[PDB]
PDB file of C-alpha atoms and ligand atoms in Angstrom:
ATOM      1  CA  UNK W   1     118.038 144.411  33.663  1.00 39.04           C
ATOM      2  CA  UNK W   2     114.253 146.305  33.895  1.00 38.03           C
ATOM      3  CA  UNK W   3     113.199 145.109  30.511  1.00 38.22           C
ATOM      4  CA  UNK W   4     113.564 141.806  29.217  1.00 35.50           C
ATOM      5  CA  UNK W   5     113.722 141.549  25.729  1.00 31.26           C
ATOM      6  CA  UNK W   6     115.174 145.111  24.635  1.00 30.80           C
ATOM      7  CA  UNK W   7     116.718 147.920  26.102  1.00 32.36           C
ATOM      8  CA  UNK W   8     116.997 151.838  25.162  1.00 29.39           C
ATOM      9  CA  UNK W   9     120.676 151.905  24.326  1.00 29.93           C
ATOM     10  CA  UNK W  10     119.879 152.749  20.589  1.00 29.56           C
ATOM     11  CA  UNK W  11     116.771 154.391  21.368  1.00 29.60           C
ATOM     12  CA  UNK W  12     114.656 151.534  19.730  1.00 32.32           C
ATOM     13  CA  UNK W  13     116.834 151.293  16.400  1.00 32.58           C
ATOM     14  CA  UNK W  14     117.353 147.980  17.002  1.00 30.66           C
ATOM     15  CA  UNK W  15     113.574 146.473  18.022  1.00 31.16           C
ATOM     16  CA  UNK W  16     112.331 145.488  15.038  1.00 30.61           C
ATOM     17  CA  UNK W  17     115.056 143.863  13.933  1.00 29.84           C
ATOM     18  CA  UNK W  18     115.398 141.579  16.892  1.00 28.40           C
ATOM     19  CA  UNK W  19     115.224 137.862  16.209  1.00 25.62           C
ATOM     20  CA  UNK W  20     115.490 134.580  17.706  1.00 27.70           C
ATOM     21  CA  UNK W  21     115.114 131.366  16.166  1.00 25.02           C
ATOM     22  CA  UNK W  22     115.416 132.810  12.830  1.00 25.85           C
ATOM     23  CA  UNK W  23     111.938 134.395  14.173  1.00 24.64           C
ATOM     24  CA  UNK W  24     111.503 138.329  14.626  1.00 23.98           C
ATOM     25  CA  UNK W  25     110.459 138.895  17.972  1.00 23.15           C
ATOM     26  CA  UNK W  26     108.909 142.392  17.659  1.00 22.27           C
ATOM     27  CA  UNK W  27     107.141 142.250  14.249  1.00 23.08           C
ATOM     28  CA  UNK W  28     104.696 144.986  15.076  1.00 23.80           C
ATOM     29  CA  UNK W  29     107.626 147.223  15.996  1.00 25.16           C
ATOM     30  CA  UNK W  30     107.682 147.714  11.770  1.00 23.38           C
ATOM     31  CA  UNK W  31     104.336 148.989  11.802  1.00 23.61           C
ATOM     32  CA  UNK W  32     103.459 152.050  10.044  1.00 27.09           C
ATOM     33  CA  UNK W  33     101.241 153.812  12.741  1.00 28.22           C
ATOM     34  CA  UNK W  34     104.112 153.642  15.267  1.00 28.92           C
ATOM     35  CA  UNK W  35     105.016 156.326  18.553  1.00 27.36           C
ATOM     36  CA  UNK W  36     106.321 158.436  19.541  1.00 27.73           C
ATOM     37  CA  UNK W  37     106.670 160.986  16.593  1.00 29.97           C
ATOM     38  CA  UNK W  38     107.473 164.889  16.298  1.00 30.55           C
ATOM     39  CA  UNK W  39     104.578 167.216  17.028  1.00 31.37           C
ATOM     40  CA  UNK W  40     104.326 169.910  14.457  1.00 32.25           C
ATOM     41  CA  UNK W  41     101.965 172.578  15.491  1.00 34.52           C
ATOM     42  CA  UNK W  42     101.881 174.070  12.445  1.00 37.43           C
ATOM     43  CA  UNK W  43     100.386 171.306  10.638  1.00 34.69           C
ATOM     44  CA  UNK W  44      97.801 170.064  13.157  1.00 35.82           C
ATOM     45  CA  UNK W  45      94.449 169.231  11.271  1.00 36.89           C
ATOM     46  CA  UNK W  46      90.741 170.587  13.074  1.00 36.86           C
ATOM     47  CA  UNK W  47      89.655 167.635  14.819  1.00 36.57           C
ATOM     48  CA  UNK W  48      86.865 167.286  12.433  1.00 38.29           C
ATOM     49  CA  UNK W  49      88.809 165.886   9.820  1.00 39.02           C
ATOM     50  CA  UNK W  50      89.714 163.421  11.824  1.00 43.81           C
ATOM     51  CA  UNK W  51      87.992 160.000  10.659  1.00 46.36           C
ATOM     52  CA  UNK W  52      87.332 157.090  13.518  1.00 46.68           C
ATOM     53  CA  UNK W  53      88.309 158.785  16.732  1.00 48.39           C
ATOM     54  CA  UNK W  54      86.526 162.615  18.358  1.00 47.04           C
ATOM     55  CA  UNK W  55      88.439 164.643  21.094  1.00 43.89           C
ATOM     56  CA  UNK W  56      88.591 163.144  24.321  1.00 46.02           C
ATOM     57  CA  UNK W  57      85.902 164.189  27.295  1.00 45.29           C
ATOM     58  CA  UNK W  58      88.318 164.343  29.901  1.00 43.83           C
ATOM     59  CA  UNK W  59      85.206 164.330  32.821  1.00 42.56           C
ATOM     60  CA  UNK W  60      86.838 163.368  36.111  1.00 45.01           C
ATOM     61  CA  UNK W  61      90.243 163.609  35.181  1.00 47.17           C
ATOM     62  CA  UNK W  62      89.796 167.885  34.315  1.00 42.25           C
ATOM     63  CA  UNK W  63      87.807 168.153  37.717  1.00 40.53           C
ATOM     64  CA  UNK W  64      89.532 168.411  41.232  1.00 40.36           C
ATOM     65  CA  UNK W  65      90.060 165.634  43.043  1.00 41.65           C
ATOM     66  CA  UNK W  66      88.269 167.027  46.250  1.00 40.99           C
ATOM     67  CA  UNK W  67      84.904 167.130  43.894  1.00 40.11           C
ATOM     68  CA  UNK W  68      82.583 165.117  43.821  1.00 39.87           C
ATOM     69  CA  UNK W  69      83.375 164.285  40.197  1.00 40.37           C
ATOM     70  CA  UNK W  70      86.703 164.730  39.853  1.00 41.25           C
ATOM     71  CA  UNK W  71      88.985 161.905  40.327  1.00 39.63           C
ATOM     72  CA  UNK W  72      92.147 160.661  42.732  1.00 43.93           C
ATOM     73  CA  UNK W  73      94.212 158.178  42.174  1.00 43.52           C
ATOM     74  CA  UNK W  74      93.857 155.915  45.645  1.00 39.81           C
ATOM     75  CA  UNK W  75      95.452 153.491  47.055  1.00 40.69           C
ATOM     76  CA  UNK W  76      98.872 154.798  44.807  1.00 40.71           C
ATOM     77  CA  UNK W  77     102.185 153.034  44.797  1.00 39.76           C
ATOM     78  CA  UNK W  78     105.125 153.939  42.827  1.00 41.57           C
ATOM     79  CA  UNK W  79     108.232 151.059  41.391  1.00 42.53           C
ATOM     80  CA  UNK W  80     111.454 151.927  42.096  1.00 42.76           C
ATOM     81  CA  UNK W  81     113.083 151.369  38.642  1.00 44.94           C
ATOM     82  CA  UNK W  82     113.338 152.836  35.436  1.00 44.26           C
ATOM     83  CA  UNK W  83     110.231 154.963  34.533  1.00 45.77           C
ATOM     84  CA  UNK W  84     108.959 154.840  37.822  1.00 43.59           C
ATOM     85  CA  UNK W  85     105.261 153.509  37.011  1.00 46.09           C
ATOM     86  CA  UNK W  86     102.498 154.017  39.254  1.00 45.51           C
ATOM     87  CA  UNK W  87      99.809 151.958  39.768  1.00 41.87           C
ATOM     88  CA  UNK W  88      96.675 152.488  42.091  1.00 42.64           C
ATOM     89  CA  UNK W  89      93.065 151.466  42.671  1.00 42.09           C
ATOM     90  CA  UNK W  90      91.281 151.626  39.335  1.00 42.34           C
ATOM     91  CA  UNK W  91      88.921 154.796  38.823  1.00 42.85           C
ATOM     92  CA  UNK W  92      85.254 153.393  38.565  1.00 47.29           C
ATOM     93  CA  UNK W  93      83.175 156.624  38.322  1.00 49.20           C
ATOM     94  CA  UNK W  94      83.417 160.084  35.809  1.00 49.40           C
ATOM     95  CA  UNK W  95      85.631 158.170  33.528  1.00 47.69           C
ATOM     96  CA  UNK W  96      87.155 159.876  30.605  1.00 47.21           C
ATOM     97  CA  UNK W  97      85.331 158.669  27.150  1.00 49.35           C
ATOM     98  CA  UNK W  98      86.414 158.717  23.182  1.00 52.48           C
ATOM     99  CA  UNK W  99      83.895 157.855  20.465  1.00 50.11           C
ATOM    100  CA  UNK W 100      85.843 155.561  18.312  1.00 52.31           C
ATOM    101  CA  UNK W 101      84.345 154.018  15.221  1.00 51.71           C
ATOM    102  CA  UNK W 102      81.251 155.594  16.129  1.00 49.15           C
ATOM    103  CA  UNK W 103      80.873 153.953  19.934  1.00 50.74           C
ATOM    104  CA  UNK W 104      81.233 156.237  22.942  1.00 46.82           C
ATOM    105  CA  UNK W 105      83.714 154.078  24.628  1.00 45.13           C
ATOM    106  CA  UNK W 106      84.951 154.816  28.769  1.00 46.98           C
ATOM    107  CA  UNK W 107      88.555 155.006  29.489  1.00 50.28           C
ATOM    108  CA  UNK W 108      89.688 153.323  32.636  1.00 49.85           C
ATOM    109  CA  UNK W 109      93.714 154.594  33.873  1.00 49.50           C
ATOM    110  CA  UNK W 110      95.553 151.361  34.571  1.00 50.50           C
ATOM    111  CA  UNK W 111      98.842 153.415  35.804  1.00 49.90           C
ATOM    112  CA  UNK W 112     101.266 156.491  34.656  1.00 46.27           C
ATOM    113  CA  UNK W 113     104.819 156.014  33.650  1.00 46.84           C
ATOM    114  CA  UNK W 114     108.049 158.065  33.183  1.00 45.95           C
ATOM    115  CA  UNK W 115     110.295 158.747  29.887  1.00 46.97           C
ATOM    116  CA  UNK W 116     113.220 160.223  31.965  1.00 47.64           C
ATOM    117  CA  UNK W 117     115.886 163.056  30.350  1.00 42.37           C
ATOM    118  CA  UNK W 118     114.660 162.699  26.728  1.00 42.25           C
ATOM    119  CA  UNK W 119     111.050 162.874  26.206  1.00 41.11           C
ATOM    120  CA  UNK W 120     109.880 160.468  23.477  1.00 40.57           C
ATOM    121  CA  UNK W 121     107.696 163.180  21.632  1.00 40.79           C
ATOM    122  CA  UNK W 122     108.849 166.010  20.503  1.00 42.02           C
ATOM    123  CA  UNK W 123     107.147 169.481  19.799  1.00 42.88           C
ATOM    124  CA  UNK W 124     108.637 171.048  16.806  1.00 42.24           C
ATOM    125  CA  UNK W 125     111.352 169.283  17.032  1.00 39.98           C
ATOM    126  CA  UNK W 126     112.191 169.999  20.717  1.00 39.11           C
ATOM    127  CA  UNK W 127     112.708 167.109  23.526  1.00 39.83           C
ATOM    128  CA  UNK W 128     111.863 167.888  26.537  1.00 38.04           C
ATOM    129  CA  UNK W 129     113.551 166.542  30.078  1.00 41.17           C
ATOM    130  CA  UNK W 130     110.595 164.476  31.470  1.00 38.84           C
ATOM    131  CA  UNK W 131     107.649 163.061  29.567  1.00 42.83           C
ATOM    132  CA  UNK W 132     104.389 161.862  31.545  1.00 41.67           C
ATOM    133  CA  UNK W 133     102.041 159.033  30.146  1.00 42.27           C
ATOM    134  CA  UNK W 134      99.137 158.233  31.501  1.00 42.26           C
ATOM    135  CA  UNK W 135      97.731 154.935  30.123  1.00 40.96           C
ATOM    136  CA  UNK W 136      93.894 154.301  30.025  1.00 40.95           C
ATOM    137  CA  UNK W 137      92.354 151.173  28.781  1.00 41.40           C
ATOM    138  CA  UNK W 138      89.200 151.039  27.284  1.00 44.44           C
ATOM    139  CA  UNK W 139      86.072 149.675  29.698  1.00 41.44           C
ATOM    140  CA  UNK W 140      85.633 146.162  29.473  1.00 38.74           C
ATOM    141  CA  UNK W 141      87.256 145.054  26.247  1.00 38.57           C
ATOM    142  CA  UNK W 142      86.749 141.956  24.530  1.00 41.05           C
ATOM    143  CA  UNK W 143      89.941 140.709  25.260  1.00 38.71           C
ATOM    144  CA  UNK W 144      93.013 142.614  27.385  1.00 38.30           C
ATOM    145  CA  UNK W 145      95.657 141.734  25.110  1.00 37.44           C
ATOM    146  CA  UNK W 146      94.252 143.228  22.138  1.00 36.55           C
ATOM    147  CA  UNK W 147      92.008 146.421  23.999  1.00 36.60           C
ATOM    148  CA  UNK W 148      91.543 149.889  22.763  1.00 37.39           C
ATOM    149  CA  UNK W 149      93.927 151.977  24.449  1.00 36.46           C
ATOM    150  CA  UNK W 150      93.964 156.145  25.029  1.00 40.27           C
ATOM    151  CA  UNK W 151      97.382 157.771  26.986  1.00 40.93           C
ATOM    152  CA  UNK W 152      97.549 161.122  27.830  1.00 38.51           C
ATOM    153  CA  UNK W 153     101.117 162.774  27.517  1.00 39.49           C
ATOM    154  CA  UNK W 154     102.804 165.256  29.481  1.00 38.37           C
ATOM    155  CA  UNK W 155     105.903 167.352  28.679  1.00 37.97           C
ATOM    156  CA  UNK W 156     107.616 169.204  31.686  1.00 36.57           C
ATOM    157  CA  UNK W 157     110.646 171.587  30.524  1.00 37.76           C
ATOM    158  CA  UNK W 158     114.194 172.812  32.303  1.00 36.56           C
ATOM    159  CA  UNK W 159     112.822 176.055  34.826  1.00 37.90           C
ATOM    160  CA  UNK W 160     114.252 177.609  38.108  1.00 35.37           C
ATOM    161  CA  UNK W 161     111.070 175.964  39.597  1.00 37.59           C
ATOM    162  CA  UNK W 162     110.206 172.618  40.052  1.00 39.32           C
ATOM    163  CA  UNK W 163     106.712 170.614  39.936  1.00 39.20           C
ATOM    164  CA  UNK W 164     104.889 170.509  43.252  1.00 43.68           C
ATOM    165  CA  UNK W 165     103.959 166.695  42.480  1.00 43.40           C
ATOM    166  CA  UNK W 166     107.285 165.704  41.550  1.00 39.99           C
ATOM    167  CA  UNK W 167     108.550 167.404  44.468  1.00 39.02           C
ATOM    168  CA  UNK W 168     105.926 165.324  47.075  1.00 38.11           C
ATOM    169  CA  UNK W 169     106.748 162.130  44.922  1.00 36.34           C
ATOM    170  CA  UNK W 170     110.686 162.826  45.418  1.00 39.44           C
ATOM    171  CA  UNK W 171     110.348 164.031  49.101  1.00 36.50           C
ATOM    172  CA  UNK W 172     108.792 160.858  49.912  1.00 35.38           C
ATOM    173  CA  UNK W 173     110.447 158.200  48.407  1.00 34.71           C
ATOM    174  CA  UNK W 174     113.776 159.803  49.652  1.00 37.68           C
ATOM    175  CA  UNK W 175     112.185 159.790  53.288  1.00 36.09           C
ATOM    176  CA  UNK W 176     111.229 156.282  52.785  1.00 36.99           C
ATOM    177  CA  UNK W 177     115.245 155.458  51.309  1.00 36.10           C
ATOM    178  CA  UNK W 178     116.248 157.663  53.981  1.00 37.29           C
ATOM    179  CA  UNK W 179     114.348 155.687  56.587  1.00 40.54           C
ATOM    180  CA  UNK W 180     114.999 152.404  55.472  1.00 43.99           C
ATOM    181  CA  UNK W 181     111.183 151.674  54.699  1.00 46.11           C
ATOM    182  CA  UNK W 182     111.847 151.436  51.039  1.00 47.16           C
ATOM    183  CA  UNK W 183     114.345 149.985  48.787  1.00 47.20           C
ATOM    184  CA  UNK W 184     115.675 151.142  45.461  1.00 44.98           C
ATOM    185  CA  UNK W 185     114.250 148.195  42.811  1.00 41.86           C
ATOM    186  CA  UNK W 186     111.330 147.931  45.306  1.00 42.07           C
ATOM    187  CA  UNK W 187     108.052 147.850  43.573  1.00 41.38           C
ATOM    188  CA  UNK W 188     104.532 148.635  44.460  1.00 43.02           C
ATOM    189  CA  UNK W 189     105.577 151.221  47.379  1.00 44.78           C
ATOM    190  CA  UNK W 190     102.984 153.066  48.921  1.00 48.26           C
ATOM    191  CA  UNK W 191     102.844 156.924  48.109  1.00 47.71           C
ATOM    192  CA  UNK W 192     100.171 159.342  48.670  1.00 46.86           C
ATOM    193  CA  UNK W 193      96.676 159.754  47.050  1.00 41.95           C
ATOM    194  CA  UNK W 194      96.551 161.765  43.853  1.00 41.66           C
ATOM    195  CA  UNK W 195      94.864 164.583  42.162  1.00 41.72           C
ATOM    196  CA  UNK W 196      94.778 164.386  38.460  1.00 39.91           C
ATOM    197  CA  UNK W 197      93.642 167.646  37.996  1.00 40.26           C
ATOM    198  CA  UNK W 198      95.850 169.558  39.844  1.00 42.17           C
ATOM    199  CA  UNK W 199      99.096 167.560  40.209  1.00 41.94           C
ATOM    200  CA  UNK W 200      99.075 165.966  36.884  1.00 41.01           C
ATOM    201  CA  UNK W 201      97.573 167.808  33.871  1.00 38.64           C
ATOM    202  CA  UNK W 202      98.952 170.797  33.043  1.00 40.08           C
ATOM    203  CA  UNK W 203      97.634 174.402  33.034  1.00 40.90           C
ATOM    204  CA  UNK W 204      95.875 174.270  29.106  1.00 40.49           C
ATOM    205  CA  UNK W 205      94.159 171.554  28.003  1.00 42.01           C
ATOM    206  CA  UNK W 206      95.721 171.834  24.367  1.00 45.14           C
ATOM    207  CA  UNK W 207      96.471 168.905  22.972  1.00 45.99           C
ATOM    208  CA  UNK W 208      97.474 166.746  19.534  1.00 48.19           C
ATOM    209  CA  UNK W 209      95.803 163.866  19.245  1.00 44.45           C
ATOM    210  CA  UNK W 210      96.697 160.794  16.613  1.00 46.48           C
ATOM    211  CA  UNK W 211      96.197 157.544  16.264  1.00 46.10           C
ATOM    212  CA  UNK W 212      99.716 155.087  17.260  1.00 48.29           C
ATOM    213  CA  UNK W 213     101.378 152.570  19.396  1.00 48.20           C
ATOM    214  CA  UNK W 214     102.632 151.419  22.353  1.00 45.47           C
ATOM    215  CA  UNK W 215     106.062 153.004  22.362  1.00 45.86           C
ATOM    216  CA  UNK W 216     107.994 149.812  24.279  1.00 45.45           C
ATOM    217  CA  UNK W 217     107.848 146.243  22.391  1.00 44.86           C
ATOM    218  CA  UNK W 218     105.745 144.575  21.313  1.00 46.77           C
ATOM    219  CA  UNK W 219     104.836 148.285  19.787  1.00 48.40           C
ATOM    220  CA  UNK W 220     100.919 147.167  19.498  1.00 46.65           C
ATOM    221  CA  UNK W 221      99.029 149.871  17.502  1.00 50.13           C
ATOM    222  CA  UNK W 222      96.100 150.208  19.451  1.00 51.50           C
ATOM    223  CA  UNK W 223      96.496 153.572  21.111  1.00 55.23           C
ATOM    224  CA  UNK W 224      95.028 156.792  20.901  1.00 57.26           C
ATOM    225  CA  UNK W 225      97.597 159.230  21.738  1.00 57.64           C
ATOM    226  CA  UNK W 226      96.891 162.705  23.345  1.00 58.49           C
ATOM    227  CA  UNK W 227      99.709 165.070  23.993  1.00 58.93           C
ATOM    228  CA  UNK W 228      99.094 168.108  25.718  1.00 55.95           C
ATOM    229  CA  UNK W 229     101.438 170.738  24.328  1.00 55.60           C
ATOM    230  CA  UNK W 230     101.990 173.369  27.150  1.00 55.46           C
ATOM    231  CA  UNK W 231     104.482 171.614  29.391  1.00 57.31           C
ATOM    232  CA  UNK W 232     105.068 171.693  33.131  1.00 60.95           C
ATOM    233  CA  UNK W 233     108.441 172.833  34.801  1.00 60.44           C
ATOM    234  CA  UNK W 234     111.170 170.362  36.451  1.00 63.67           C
ATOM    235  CA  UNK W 235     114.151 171.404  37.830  1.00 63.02           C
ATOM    236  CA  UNK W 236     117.543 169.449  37.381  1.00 65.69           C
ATOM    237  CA  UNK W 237     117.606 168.894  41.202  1.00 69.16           C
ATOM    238  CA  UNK W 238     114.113 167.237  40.706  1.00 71.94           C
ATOM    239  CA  UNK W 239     115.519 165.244  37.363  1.00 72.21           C
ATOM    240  CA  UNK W 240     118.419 163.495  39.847  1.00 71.97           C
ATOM    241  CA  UNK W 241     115.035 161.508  42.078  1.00 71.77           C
ATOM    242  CA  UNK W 242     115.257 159.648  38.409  1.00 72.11           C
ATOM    243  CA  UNK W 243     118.767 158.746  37.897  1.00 73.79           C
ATOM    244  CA  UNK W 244     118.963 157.965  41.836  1.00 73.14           C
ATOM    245  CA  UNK W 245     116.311 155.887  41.349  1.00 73.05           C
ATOM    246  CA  UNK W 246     116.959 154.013  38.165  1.00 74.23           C
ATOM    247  CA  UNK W 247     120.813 153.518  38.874  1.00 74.94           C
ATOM    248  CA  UNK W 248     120.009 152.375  42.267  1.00 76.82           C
ATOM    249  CA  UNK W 249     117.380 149.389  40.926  1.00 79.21           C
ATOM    250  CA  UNK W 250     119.673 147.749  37.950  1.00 81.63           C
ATOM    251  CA  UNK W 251     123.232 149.365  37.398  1.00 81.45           C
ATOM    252  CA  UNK W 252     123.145 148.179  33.865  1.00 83.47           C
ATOM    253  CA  UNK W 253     119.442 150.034  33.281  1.00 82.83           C
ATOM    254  CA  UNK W 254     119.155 153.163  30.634  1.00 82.83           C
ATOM    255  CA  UNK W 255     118.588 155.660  32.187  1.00 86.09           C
ATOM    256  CA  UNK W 256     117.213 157.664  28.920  1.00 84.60           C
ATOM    257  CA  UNK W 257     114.592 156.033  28.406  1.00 83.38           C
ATOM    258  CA  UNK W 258     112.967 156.808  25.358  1.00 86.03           C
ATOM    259  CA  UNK W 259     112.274 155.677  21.900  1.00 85.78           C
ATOM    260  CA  UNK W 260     113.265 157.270  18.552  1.00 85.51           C
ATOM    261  CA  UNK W 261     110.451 159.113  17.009  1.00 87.06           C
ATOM    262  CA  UNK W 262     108.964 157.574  14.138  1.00 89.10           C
ATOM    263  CA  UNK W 263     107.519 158.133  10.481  1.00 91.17           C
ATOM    264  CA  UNK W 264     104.295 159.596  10.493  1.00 92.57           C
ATOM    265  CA  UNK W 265     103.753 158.234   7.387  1.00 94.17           C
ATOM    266  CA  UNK W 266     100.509 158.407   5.972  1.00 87.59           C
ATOM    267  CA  UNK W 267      98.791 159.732   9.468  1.00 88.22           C
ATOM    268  CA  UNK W 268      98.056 163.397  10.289  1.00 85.70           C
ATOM    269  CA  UNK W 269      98.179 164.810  13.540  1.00 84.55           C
ATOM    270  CA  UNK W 270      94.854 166.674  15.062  1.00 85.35           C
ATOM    271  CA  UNK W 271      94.901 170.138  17.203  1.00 81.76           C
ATOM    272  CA  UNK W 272      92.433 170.069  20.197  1.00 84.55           C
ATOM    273  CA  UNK W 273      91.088 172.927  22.552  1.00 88.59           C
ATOM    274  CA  UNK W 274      92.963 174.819  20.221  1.00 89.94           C
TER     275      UNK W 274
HETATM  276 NA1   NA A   1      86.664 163.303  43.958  1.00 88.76          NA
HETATM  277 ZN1   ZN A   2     105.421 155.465  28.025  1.00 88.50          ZN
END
């Protein structure tokens, strides 16, 4: 019931063979620059090599919030369903920037998202519990539906000690449940202002960048990935806020919600702040 068209009961294995009307209904799903995919460090590429696309300047997403430029999410609200996206008022000033195809171009973030008990990338092979993606469009595009996108990915592993933000995020929306303020399959609840810098991105800025897709249908490849490779920590007492929360919205959601990772194909994957 939270997606339309598809679910995540076979991971993805099934998108691009959907079809109705005798017509496919994911066609770019069969792309060959597709996402997620496995991170090998050992064959990252110096980001030099890299034709098209340079390292990201993170600017006002790497600077505290409480700084003058360093950016907070305002106005943030949080949906109540699978992947638990969060929207807020969009960032205006020290926005991130990539030069692709030779243009500096600014990154607005249009919300974050969850990939909840398997993390769609992998890291040598390894899932992790929780995956973060941030999802940044590129400043005034030509057209929406076709715009130059850039997400930033976050891994968080199994520890003893949780994450403070997903410990505010789960202490809230269980006061507001508790309370009777808030609904599970509510969207657009209000939540607190954050920090990118210090809730959100983790403690290195290493990342692997390479050049995919959106990893839900229709799979557009128009994204510049960026996965930071040092992970946060979760706890499984922190993992439950998920299941609670996607259960509680649909009873027939997934609650792993992640796609297969895909063929890298003819792609190579890039090591920054290495
Ligand atoms: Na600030
Ligand atoms: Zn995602």
């Amino acid at each position: 019931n939270p997606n339309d068209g598809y679910d995540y009961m076979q991971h993805g294995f099934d998108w691009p063979g959907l079809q109705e009307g005798g017509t496919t209904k994911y066609p770019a799903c069969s792309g060959s620059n597709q996402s997620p995919i496995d991170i090998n460090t050992n064959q990252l590429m110096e980001p030099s090599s890299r034709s098209g696309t340079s390292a990201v300047s993170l600017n006002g997403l790497n600077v505290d919030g409480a700084q003058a430029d360093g950016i907070t999410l305002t106005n943030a609200k949080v949906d109540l369903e699978q992947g638990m996206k969060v929207t807020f008022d969009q960032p205006a000033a020290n926005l991130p920037t990539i030069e692709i195809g030779g243009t500096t171009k600014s990154f607005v973030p249009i919300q974050f998202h969850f990939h909840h008990f398997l993390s769609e990338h992998t890291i040598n092979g390894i899932h992790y519990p929780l995956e973060l993606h941030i999802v940044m469009q590129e400043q005034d595009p030509a057209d929406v539906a076709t715009a130059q996108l850039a997400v930033i990915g976050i891994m968080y592993k199994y520890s003893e000690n949780g994450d403070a933000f997903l410990n505010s995020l789960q202490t809230q929306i269980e006061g507001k449940i508790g309370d009777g303020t808030a609904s599970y399959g509510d969207t657009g609840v209000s939540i607190d202002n954050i920090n990118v810098k210090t809730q959100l991105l983790p403690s290195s800025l290493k990342y692997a960048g390479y050049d995919g897709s959106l990893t839900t249908p229709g799979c557009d490849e128009r994204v510049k990935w960026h996965v930071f490779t040092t992970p946060r920590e979760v706890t499984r007492e922190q993992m439950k806020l998920f299941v609670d929360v996607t259960m509680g919205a649909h009873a027939g959601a997934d609650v792993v919600n992640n796609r297969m990772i895909q063929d890298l194909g003819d792609r190579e994957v890039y090591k920054y702040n290495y």
